[PDB]
Design a protein around this ligand. Sequence first.
Ligand code: HEM
Length: 291
Amino acid sequence: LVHVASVEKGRSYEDFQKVYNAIALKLREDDEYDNYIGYGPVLVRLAWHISGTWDKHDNTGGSYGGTYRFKKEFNDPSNAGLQNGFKFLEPIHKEFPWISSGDLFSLGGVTAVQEMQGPKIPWRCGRVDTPEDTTPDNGRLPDADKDAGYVRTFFQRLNMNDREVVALMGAHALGKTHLKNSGYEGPGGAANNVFTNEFYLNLLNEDWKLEKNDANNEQWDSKSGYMMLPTDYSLIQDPKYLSIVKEYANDQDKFFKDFSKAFEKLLEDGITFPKDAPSPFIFKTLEEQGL
Ligand code: HEM
């Protein structure tokens, strides 16, 4: 497969800035969801799940085709809980019917990180909706009950190296795990709807204890009332992942710069950009616009 990016006909930077402003205004408005965490965390989880199905070997999956709109992908057990981010963006897609699904789903993640005081993520337009028979089969997304070798091996399918994996996982400071969606329960830190380097500081400074939860799954719990998944805790058990974790705990600006590059790469995997294509867009936040 080749998936060549095609710009939505006649659209420019200012058109996309209006879809970004509509998502960001609705993030401001619907601030009560999930005990006042708001929709920012579930929207970056949605952008990572529609992108994490990619396979480098045959170019199938990935954000291009916007195939999470189909029932097979939508009802994947690993996507339980994302129906909420879908329902959030759905009025916005009726307001801007020209935007493709892969572009809206991925831009939702970019808008959420920037509006939660995260780094600026450059974003490129041009994903094209593809037919229901291009929808990936279930089972390409990662398990949480595993170790650092599984994590390393998993992310090699999306050719992410060690530093990209540790930067990307820092998004687990956002939102929380929910027992009815995944069989895990609890948040990763205190500031879970502001983007910071908190995940790394917690993983290095909390007294973590291994316990089984009410779904019979193991997780690491701390005195503070925080939790870590087996795959998260992995990052301090592997010597190569641990030096990068220490680096981001001591330097939030390095973390923001690396998360920015790795997240854009994740959202563009599997897509060919022609060089007549527009350069990546950097969107202004509401605050920068006075809105
Ligand atoms: C080995 C990789 C990963 C595993 C096993 C994993 C697993 C999980 C699980 C089990 C949840 C909880 C879902 C729920 O109960 O609602 C979760 C939440 C979340 N994940 Fe991941 N994750 C991984 C990687 C990532 C990456 C790379 C990102 C983003 C760049 C990410 C972003 C999020 C976010 C923001 C949440 C919170 C969602 C919410 O509050 O509803 N995850 N993760």
